[PDB]
């Protein structure tokens, strides 16, 4: 929110971002039950409804064949995938042996029951219990004697009520071959996100966080297919765990140095360009640009992607060819005109002789710019026009 | 209570090379900036240079080519040399203390000396 | 090159909040910390970030930022103090601001 400039290496700090660390996993196990449809009072006899329990079958049938060919291809954000192997292989012990018998046997009464794991790690079971509830006890007696959908015709209507979850989720696992990158309101709905992370092993204070961007703790969440035994649907669905909730964090944009006289555009050109954060008093930076994202103040980041850099590297802010900490920093003369998209502003530097000038759209083009590298915030202009190419700057600000 | 001392002088001609000295007692780490705040009678304080503990230097700049700061580590003091001293830079000397990495990294100072007077005549 | 212009004089009656601003160019943009330096003594930090506190000081002593005005607000100012707040912000330079001193009316 408070961007300052360093005209030593012509580079721009803001420094107004608190961050949010993702750490852990946090596993879940659903399980799902399509009823007794299996076999039950078929025949031969063409009705409305009937036309709806075939559905029921074939997604049953294409949940086998997408299940049985989930264990095919087990043939001995991408910073994040070190995460995907560490779910399949957490689904691989849950779903060998007879741990779903225990797990199971957790939910016999209760929809809900932490288990144990055989390698200790704590795992939440959930229960839905909703469809067996109407297929069994609601529709039994209803279809007697294969005389089907005439003594009715409200109960035909709510037959789709109780049947679009499974048919959405295995539509879902059919076509993604298991892995769901998003959590969806399929799998998983309200009263069951902040029921399942509200068990996290965690402080009292990232939970709150959570519970506010649950939206994004959707978009980080990602779920696997475990398999399907008897009338049921085993899957689970892994949840970010973020350790810490507020550390200070800030931004570097850089650009080409300056200029040299005599005609000979020699500078340096500063090839940082990323984020910091703190975890335990030791800052890490992550390599890439596109790996966190503002919320508002806050920012989203994963601690499986960023770099630890060792403490006194902090003067990298003066470049005086300083001798405690090496900055690294590549080296060309090679001058490259360019524009550096500061939040708060924007970093303008045009060297071979380009007129540069700055519009606000009402004022028109009035203060034209200087060749060396100059800082233009979004108070004082509203664009940084070069030729044809005008450049629009953010509404926020700070 | 790394408490700051400084000391030199009091009394300079003009055209020639007032310096000052300020130590530390109770550690110059490489955690502090180390600057010399001065303030001419009329009380409107001017900034003249800090002093990083490894080579890092910055002077105000309608100061340059006048100032020079150093460091003695070896007794925890730094010291300054002005040059062409004139009887517009009579002020009094303070040596601060500035913390770092809240704002640039430079930020606000912390504790401040006591002041000694330097007169020109 | 840049000033941070405050105005010279505040008057405030006992026991009522007082406000000093401290009007940058591009204000808020930038960090800005105040100084207390009674007369005689060297100046010791109030605030700095504009809204911090480091140590001791007591809790009647708040800042704010805002548009292009830092505002520093002393909550039922006391006789105690009558010193010569003034600012800064770095822009390569350090500038100071003008001083401006509170009267209490003795």
């Known amino acids: 929110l408070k961007e300052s400039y360093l005209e030593e290496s012509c580079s721009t700090i803001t420094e107004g971002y608190l961050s949010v660390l993702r750490t852990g996993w946090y596993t879940n196990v659903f399980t799902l039950e399509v009823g007794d449809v299996e076999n039950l009072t078929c025949a031969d006899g063409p009705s409305l409804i009937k036309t709806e329990l075939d559905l029921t079958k074939s997604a049953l049938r294409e949940l086998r064949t997408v299940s049985a060919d989930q264990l095919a291809r087990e043939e001995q954000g991408v910073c994040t995938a070190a995460a995907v192997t560490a779910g399949v292989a957490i689904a691989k012990t849950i779903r060998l042996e007879s741990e779903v018998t225990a797990i199971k046997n957790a939910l016999k009464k209760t929809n809900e029951a932490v288990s144990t794991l055989g390698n200790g790690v704590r795992v939440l079971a959930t229960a839905v219990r909703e469809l067996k509830d109407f297929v069994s006890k609601n529709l039994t007696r209803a279809i007697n004697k294969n005389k089907c959908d005439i003594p009715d015709l409200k109960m035909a209507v709510s037959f789709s009520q109780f049947n679009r979850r499974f048919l959405n989720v295995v539509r879902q696992f059919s076509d993604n071959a298991g892995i769901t990158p998003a959590i969806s309101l399929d799998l998983m709905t309200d009263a069951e996100l902040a029921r399942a992370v509200s068990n996290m092993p965690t402080s009292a204070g990232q939970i709150k966080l959570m519970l506010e961007n649950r939206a994004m703790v959707r978009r980080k969440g990602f779920g696997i297919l475990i398999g399907v035994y008897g009338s049921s649907v085993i899957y689970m669905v892994q949840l970010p765990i973020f350790g810490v909730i507020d550390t200070p964090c800030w931004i570097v944009k850089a650009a080409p140095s300056c200029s040299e006289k005599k005609g000979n555009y020699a500078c340096l050109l500063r090839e940082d360009q990323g984020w910091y954060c703190q975890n335990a008093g030791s800052t890490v930076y992550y390599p890439n640009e596109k790996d966190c994202e503002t919320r508002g103040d806050h920012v989203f980041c994963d601690t499986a992607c960023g770099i630890n850099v060792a403490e006194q590297s902090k003067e990298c802010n003066i470049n005086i060819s300083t001798t405690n900490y090496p900055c690294k920093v590549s080296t060309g003369r090679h001058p490259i005109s360019m524009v550096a998209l500061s939040p708060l502003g924007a970093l303008v530097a045009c060297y071979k002789g380009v007129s540069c000038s700055i519009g606000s759209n009402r004022v028109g083009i009035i203060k034209q710019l200087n060749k060396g590298c100059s800082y233009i915030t979004n108070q004082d202009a509203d664009t940084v026009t070069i030729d044809n190419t005008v450049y629009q700057l953010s509404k926020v600000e700070g | 209570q790394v408490q700051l001392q400084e000391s030199g002088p009091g009394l300079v001609k003009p055209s020639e090379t007032l310096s000052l000295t300020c130590t530390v007692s109770?550690?110059?780490?490489?955690?502090?900036?180390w600057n010399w705040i001065r303030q001419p009678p009329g009380k409107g304080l001017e900034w003249i240079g800090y002093?990083?503990?490894?080579?890092?230097?910055k002077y105000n700049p309608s100061l340059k080519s006048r100032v020079t700061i150093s460091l003695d580590m070896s007794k925890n003091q730094f010291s300054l040399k002005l040059r062409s001293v004139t009887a517009a830079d009579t002020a009094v000397y303070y040596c601060?203390?500035?913390?770092?990495?809240?704002?640039?990294?430079?930020?606000?100072?912390?504790?401040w000396g006591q002041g000694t007077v330097v007169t020109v005549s | 090159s840049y000033e941070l212009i405050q105005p010279p004089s505040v008057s405030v009656s006992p026991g009522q909040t007082a406000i000093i601003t401290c009007s940058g160019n591009?204000?808020?943009?930038?960090?800005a910390c105040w100084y207390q330096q009674k007369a005689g003594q060297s100046p010791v930090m109030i605030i700095y970030?504009?809204?911090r506190r480091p140590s001791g000081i007591p809790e009647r002593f708040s800042g704010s930022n805002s548009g292009n005005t830092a505002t520093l607000t002393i909550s039922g100012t006391q006789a105690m103090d009558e010193a010569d707040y003034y600012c800064?912000?770095?822009?390569?330079?350090?500038?100071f601001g003008g001083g401006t001193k509170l009267t209490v009316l003795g």
């Open positions: 800064q912000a770095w822009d390569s330079s350090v500038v």
């Open positions: 601060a203390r500035g913390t770092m990495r809240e704002s640039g990294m430079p930020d606000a100072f912390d504790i």
């Open positions: 591009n204000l808020g943009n930038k960090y």
């Open positions: 970030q504009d809204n």
């Open positions: 109770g550690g110059s780490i490489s955690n502090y900036y």
């Open positions: 002093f990083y503990y490894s080579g890092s230097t």
